[PDB]
Amino acid sequence: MADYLISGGTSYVPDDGLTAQQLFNCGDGLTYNDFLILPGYIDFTADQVDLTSALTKKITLKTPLVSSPMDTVTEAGMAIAMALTGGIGFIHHNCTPEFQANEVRKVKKYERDYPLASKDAKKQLPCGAAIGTHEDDKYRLDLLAQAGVDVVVLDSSQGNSIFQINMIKYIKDKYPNLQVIGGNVVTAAQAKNLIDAGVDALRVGMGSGSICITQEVLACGRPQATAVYKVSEYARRFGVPVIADGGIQNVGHIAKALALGASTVMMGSLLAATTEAPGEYFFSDGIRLKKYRGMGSLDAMDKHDKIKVAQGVSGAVQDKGSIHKFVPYLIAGIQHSCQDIGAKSLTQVRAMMYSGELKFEKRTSSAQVEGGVHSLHSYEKRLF
Amino acid sequence: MADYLISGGTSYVPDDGLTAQQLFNCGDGLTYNDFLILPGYIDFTADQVDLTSALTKKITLKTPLVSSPMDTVTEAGMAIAMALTGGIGFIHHNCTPEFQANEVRKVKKYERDYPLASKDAKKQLPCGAAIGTHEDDKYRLDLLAQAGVDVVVLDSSQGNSIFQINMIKYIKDKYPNLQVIGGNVVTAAQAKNLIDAGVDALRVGMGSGSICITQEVLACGRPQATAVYKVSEYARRFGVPVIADGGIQNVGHIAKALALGASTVMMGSLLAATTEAPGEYFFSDGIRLKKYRGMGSLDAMDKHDKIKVAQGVSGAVQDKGSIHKFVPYLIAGIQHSCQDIGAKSLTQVRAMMYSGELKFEKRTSSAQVEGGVHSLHSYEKRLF
Amino acid sequence: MADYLISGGTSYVPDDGLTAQQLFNCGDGLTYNDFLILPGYIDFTADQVDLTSALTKKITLKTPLVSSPMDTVTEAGMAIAMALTGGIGFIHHNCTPEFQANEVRKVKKYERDYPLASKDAKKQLPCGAAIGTHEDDKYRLDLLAQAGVDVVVLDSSQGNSIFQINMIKYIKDKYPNLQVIGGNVVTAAQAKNLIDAGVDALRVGMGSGSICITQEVLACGRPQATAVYKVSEYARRFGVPVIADGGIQNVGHIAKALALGASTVMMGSLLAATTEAPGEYFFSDGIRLKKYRGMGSLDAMDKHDKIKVAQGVSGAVQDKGSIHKFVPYLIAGIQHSCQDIGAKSLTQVRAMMYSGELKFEKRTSSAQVEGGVHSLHSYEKRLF
Amino acid sequence: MADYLISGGTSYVPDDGLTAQQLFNCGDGLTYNDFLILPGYIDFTADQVDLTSALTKKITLKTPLVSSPMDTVTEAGMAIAMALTGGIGFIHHNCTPEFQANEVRKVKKYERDYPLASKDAKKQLPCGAAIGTHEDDKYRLDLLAQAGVDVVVLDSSQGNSIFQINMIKYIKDKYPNLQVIGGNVVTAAQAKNLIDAGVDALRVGMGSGSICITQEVLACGRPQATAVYKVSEYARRFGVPVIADGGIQNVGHIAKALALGASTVMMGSLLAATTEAPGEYFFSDGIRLKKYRGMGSLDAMDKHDKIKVAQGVSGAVQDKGSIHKFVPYLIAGIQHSCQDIGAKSLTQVRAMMYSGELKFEKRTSSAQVEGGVHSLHSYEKRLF
Numbered sequence A, B, C, D: 001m002a003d004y005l006i007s008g009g010t011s012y013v014p015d016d017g018l019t020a021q022q023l024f025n026c027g028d029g030l031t032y033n034d035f036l037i038l039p040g041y042i043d044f045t046a047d048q049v050d051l052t053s054a055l056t057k058k059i060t061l062k063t064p065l066v067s068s069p070m071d072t073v074t075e076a077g078m079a080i081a082m083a084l085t086g087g088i089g090f091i092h093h094n095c096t097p098e099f100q101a102n103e104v105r106k107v108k109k110y111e112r113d114y115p116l117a118s119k120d121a122k123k124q125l126p127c128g129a130a131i132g133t134h135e136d137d138k139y140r141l142d143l144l145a146q147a148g149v150d151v152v153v154l155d156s157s158q159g160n161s162i163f164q165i166n167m168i169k170y171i172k173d174k175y176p177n178l179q180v181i182g183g184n185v186v187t188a189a190q191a192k193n194l195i196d197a198g199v200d201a202l203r204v205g206m207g208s209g210s211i212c213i214t215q216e217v218l219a220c221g222r223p224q225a226t227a228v229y230k231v232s233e234y235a236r237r238f239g240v241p242v243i244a245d246g247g248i249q250n251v252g253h254i255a256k257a258l259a260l261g262a263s264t265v266m267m268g269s270l271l272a273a274t275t276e277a278p279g280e281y282f283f284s285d286g287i288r289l290k291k292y293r294g295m296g297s298l299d300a301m302d303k304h305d306k307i308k309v310a311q312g313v314s315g316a317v318q319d320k321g322s323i324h325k326f327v328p329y330l331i332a333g334i335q336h337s338c339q340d341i342g343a344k345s346l347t348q349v350r351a352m353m354y355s356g357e358l359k360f361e362k363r364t365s366s367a368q369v370e371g372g373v374h375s376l377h378s379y380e381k382r383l384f
């Protein structure tokens, strides 16, 4: 009976790799490409992995994927597609309040099989919308609330402000049933103020986005993986989920963001130039392209005698096809990643991470080269 | 559903204190008085604590207490008392083989209520006996095996020898059903050789005993708490329990030895001058005393023209009363200690320790003074 | 204008010594004698130091001193004396509920000048009382509430239990206006559970008391200075004050406990054998003495067939005179200590400590010897 | 009253990121791109940020921007433009003394709206001029003093020399009212000698300039961010401001230099190929360009048989437009950066930095890639 009595089953496991706490205690400003998750023990098949995810304190999704509130990413079409694949879309506010409300209404009234489709308590697709922290945003909010919006995100580069805190309080007084997402934040100190003010989730990231130049221009921000880990670890103490926002370039980045403590992942460029994204396709040197621009680029700010300091750029992204084809690929990828690290659900991934059972490893520059494609004359990379 | 979905229950727990791995990675030669166990969460009562303990790979006891094979500690009387209170005694070999075998026979034929009493498969009290690693010990072993001994301990200060390894192999060939305890060892390197040779448990400790001067004379040994932790951590990988032997002065020391990975605790001085211990009581300045001596003292070695290098001393210990009164006090103490640290069983204490959930703290010299009785003119310390 | 413009006043200050965060990040189990506070800048006189202190979330005292709920320390006489000198006393519960309630009534109805005297909203002296976590303590609590008690302390060695959490909830439901002190705790993990359950203050300390042997017997506890710093730092986040309890031997210890984050300091032995303490004076070899005993000593437990594991001892303490003479000395000492470290109030001491402005230094053993009296043939130590 | 009494307001702030002292204690030779400033708490608008800056002990500017004394950067036109936008220009000395004095006189006699325009006590634009440390520089200094120059910079790659110290003493004897800037220095040891000799400011930087090859040729220099932090921290003790000189490529670099302790920032390439810069525009492959060269390049040294060891290169820089359009953009950028990090003035930025309230983070190579523009097919970067 010694085989059981020494340690209560709870067998010996050789200690290899670093816990997340150790990896991010080193003070290096790590981001996603700087580390790997070590593989675990596999006892099940990839199709059994559950991706149920908390968007806010009270809104639950079938998948962890959400589309960013950007005028080249999310309108009613994108919101409908993401809700049907089991996520959610946030409708941008670079438009008039009535226009934005009409987009919300199209999503709320919408209606080749969608077992994961997100619904509210009335069998309607959920829809989010963005607002600012200026005075006219109160009227915009009233119209959105009337359209039946399910959650609003307070859209700012630096959410730890008197303006955002006042707006949060105004909302939680006038609309007690509305869920509010605050941000963007990258530190626990910012997160504390926003959680004290009553947000139901946090949007995490500053300057990591593909179109962002805030770190270069204003010298302020944080490496994204560290930002996600630190804010998630703080917000977990109060039961507040975090949306990891910016710098997602592939399925591995999604999996890493979730393993570091995020509950949902927001995507910009990775959903741009899909069919459901707004704007028209164009051609340049034989490649199909669609515009994709920062909300702080001059063109986006000139969308309605003083210096305007641009914080984003305006570019183009290559065609990706349909959301209905692309999102299943991401889902299958995340499921395979969970299987490799030995977890039956995203909830269990994060539980293993906080308990120290999940292990990580740094990657030097040579290790990143080794990790990519190398030593070939030519190749084709087809993902699915 | 976020309250569950973020981390799967598995709530936030502030990080305070050191894991055992961290405490013993510091390289300080710590022993028992140098550290404390931090308190945990209490959900049950002390009388519900289960003290079931593995003595060997195949022998299980109701309590973790065993009496040392010393000619001032354990003969048939002590062995019977410890078996009745739920532990075991090891009969010493500073005597003729027929004498030792007769002691074993008295224990095996023995027979105010003993629900914890240790039994074998034939409703008989279990009994251990010590042997050396010289040639005549083979004949001594034959007699002990005929008397029906349940386990033998190979009695040496430094068990990692060709002599002990040969004796272990001889025993495991001639008596395949006999359990063998090897030792004493204080390092993983020694433990590896003995476990490879096929021992069913390890006796841990060198120079920590109350009567021992081996560290002073031969400069060889180890601080006991470190020795127990290191050897237990190695032996756990192969399912081999360890007996922590030497330097136990009180119930806190017992609890610490068990929390560091030991399965059973051996006691010398703490059981000397009990009524069941051999030898007669005497008086010296109005105090009742009984002799207690090291097996490597000159008097013990003169018990059967060359230098004899003594490794122990010969002294006297104050009267303690009956084993039947004293052992219940130790049991109640260990149960209260487990309750304070939040464990329902010794198995769960060790599981918590290896998983990092159990936390520890060092104690400076001022901290040890603060921990003891201080700032009083006089006092009486009555333990139970 | 550079003299101002470079750093906004905020002059250069050479970096010397360790912040508290650094001192307690080292992992050594430090207690009070292991460190010193470095002196600061003096701009005022000692008599201007304000000692206003928070006892609970809603009870404020003129001084930080409280008397322990022990049957050799605090009854109505001690409670009246401590309330008159600007602190508070907690009446012990090693007595019948009616007896305890009568003590509370004597304090509440009491009535050579006391500008610091503690009062409640009705110009009555405040009074605390201790209760246990067993079922009959509910009836004891009802009687105490009727007597008009202002605060109750839940009296346990290990407060992080289902029993204490249930009792706290029962109290906060039946008596919403009663302040409740939970404990004893020594870790942030324990503090989290108790703060979540709704305590208004925390009692900190396990095994540090002069009469305590818990660390020796049960191996569980913590060095007191570390315990105070860690729990205070956690409890500060939720606005919960801590009472530092046990191991206070002099004014320097009081000052250190307050600088480490405690709001009030509890005293046992240091108030025993005062005139107001219960029990009679006796003589032993020409010294005047009074009994002082742990609440977990056998005699205290035999105050009304099973092992009782003692956790305290029973001793005697030398006569100290009157509380009305002794407490002013402690007050003057604390004020001088604050002046030396450059703080106008205890609140400002703790603010400096948390901001890193207050600096500390470790003391080796030789440093502690040098710090005490040395190099003399004889001496008299008269404190005031 | 506990909410105030525990810590005196002075709320809890989660500890995230590194202080500047910690960031530069690591011994890595960091420069600007290696780190970020973490965002703080915003309570005000960007247009309220005050950029008042100390140029010397006694000269104060409305903005922290100064133009470098280089013959492709600063003559009378540039000096007038920078003084009108609230900064200052230093006229180069690669010319005859009478020529340089005539430039100074044009600035001193000069005359939209310029609310920030720098003035002296006589309502005249301030003007600086560079001199060397050779004997003929004494006569050059006499002419400059007669032209009414307000400050002189002693122009050297390595200012910690007997020549520079003698020249400083000569100046402070013959012209007690003239402000003197010494440099360039990169270490506290050099700064000590120059401050002891009586300089009123320090020019910091060696080899970081865009046109500089000193680090490659002579192996001597320092990474610029470390140089600025170290020298600023030393010079602050004596009330001496530092000008951060070299390697400024964008607004984020300016903000970082100021947050590390610099009072003003000097710019070379970033002001070259402006309209006010001397030299003519030319075309090369359809791009408008203007020459920009190091003062230690062969062409600059051949401006008046022996090896000349070049320390700079000679190149061309793309057209930037007018100083009057470009400088407002930098000003607005610096103000937004201060707002993001939560400071109402540059003085407050540095106060937060020295007090440990301002926090920083390192950036790995992957973090720098993530910080830039990525994951796009094409883009346009328009800054304002």
Ligand SMILES: NC(=O)c1ccc[n+]([C@@H]2O[C@H](COP(=O)([O-])OP(=O)(O)OC[C@H]3O[C@@H](n4cnc5c(N)ncnc54)[C@H](O)[C@@H]3O)[C@@H](O)[C@H]2O)c1
Pocket (backbone or CB within 6 Å): A132, A133, A134, A135, A155, A156, A157, A158, A161, A163, A184, A205, A206, A207, A208, A212, A214, A294, A295, A296, A311, A312, D042, D045, D046, D339
């Ligand atoms: N790193 C990022 O995540 C990031 C970075 C840059 C821009 N963006 C995006 O670009 C867009 C612009 O964001 P932004 O940060 O400029 O936010 P914003 O437009 O709300 O802020 C503009 C400026 O006005 C101030 N302001 C805000 N509310 C105010 C009020 N009520 N009264 C007075 N002043 C007020 C802000 O503090 C800020 O200085 C947003 O959509 C944002 O999401 C994101």
Ligand SMILES: NC(=O)c1ccc[n+]([C@@H]2O[C@H](COP(=O)([O-])OP(=O)(O)OC[C@H]3O[C@@H](n4cnc5c(N)ncnc54)[C@H](O)[C@@H]3O)[C@@H](O)[C@H]2O)c1
Pocket (backbone or CB within 6 Å): B132, B133, B134, B135, B155, B156, B157, B158, B161, B163, B184, B205, B206, B207, B208, B212, B214, B294, B295, B296, B311, B312
């Ligand atoms: N620290 C401790 O735990 C400790 C220390 C000293 C003594 N003791 C006790 O004192 C007693 C003395 O034991 P010991 O350690 O002296 O061991 P031991 O009496 O078996 O050995 C005595 C010496 O003889 C050698 N030897 C052993 N077997 C041999 C063989 N077959 N052929 C040739 N040489 C052989 C040993 O290696 C050793 O040098 C034991 O009861 C022991 O438990 C214990």
Ligand SMILES: NC(=O)c1ccc[n+]([C@@H]2O[C@H](COP(=O)([O-])OP(=O)(O)OC[C@H]3O[C@@H](n4cnc5c(N)ncnc54)[C@H](O)[C@@H]3O)[C@@H](O)[C@H]2O)c1
Pocket (backbone or CB within 6 Å): B042, B045, B046, B339, C132, C133, C134, C135, C155, C156, C157, C158, C161, C163, C184, C205, C206, C207, C208, C212, C214, C294, C295, C296, C311, C312
């Ligand atoms: N280090 C210290 O601070 C310290 C140490 C020892 C004793 N003491 C003092 O001595 C006295 C003894 O306190 P104690 O710690 O023994 O606590 P206690 O007397 O309340 O508990 C005795 C035992 O009964 C259990 N128990 C408590 N409430 C229960 C309930 N409702 N149902 C079932 N079981 C319950 C406890 O968990 C504990 O094991 C107290 O006055 C205490 O303050 C203090």
Ligand SMILES: NC(=O)c1ccc[n+]([C@@H]2O[C@H](COP(=O)([O-])OP(=O)(O)OC[C@H]3O[C@@H](n4cnc5c(N)ncnc54)[C@H](O)[C@@H]3O)[C@@H](O)[C@H]2O)c1
Pocket (backbone or CB within 6 Å): D132, D133, D134, D135, D155, D156, D157, D158, D161, D163, D184, D205, D206, D207, D208, D212, D214, D294, D295, D296, D311, D312
């Ligand atoms: N890293 C930089 O900041 C940097 C680097 C290289 C060049 N520069 C610039 O290029 C130009 C060249 O400057 P430099 O550093 O060559 O200094 P410099 O021209 O004054 O010195 C040239 C050499 O002559 C020596 N010298 C100087 N004064 C002397 C005296 N009175 N008597 C005898 N010898 C003397 C110097 O020590 C040096 O070895 C300057 O405008 C400088 O600002 C700057």
Ligand SMILES: *c1nc2c(ncn2[C@@H]2O[C@H](COP(=O)(O)O)[C@@H](O)[C@H]2O)c(=O)[nH]1
Pocket (backbone or CB within 6 Å): A068, A069, A070, A184, A205, A207, A208, A209, A210, A211, A212, A213, A214, A245, A246, A247, A248, A266, A267, A268, A269, A270, A293, A294, A295, A296, A297, A311, A312, A313
């Ligand atoms: C910086 N960041 C900006 C800007 N507009 C939006 N954003 C942020 O980027 C995210 C998208 O990043 P991708 O990497 O493309 O997925 C958005 O969600 C938002 O947080 C901007 O102008 N400057």
Ligand SMILES: *c1nc2c(ncn2[C@@H]2O[C@H](COP(=O)(O)O)[C@@H](O)[C@H]2O)c(=O)[nH]1
Pocket (backbone or CB within 6 Å): B068, B069, B070, B184, B205, B207, B208, B209, B210, B211, B212, B213, B214, B245, B246, B247, B248, B266, B267, B268, B269, B270, B293, B294, B295, B296, B297, B311, B312, B313
């Ligand atoms: C050193 N150690 C010795 C000797 N004889 C026995 N022992 C060891 O001491 C243990 C008992 O220690 P206590 O602290 O009294 O409980 C024994 O079990 C054995 O391991 C000796 O001569 N020298």
Ligand SMILES: *c1nc2c(ncn2[C@@H]2O[C@H](COP(=O)(O)O)[C@@H](O)[C@H]2O)c(=O)[nH]1
Pocket (backbone or CB within 6 Å): C068, C069, C070, C184, C205, C207, C208, C209, C210, C211, C212, C213, C214, C245, C246, C247, C248, C266, C267, C268, C269, C270, C293, C294, C295, C296, C297, C311, C312, C313
């Ligand atoms: C251990 N600790 C005990 C016991 N009774 C009370 N206490 C604790 O000691 C404190 C007093 O300590 P001093 O150092 O004398 O001031 C009490 O307040 C309580 O916390 C006991 O039996 N065992």
Ligand SMILES: *c1nc2c(ncn2[C@@H]2O[C@H](COP(=O)(O)O)[C@@H](O)[C@H]2O)c(=O)[nH]1
Pocket (backbone or CB within 6 Å): D068, D069, D070, D184, D205, D207, D208, D209, D210, D211, D212, D213, D214, D245, D246, D247, D248, D266, D267, D268, D269, D270, D293, D294, D295, D296, D297, D311, D312, D313
């Ligand atoms: C090295 N450094 C040189 C030389 N001439 C001037 N300088 C330095 O460079 C600064 C300008 O740097 P940018 O990065 O263009 O702004 C000047 O202010 C001066 O310190 C040289 O020949 N070699």
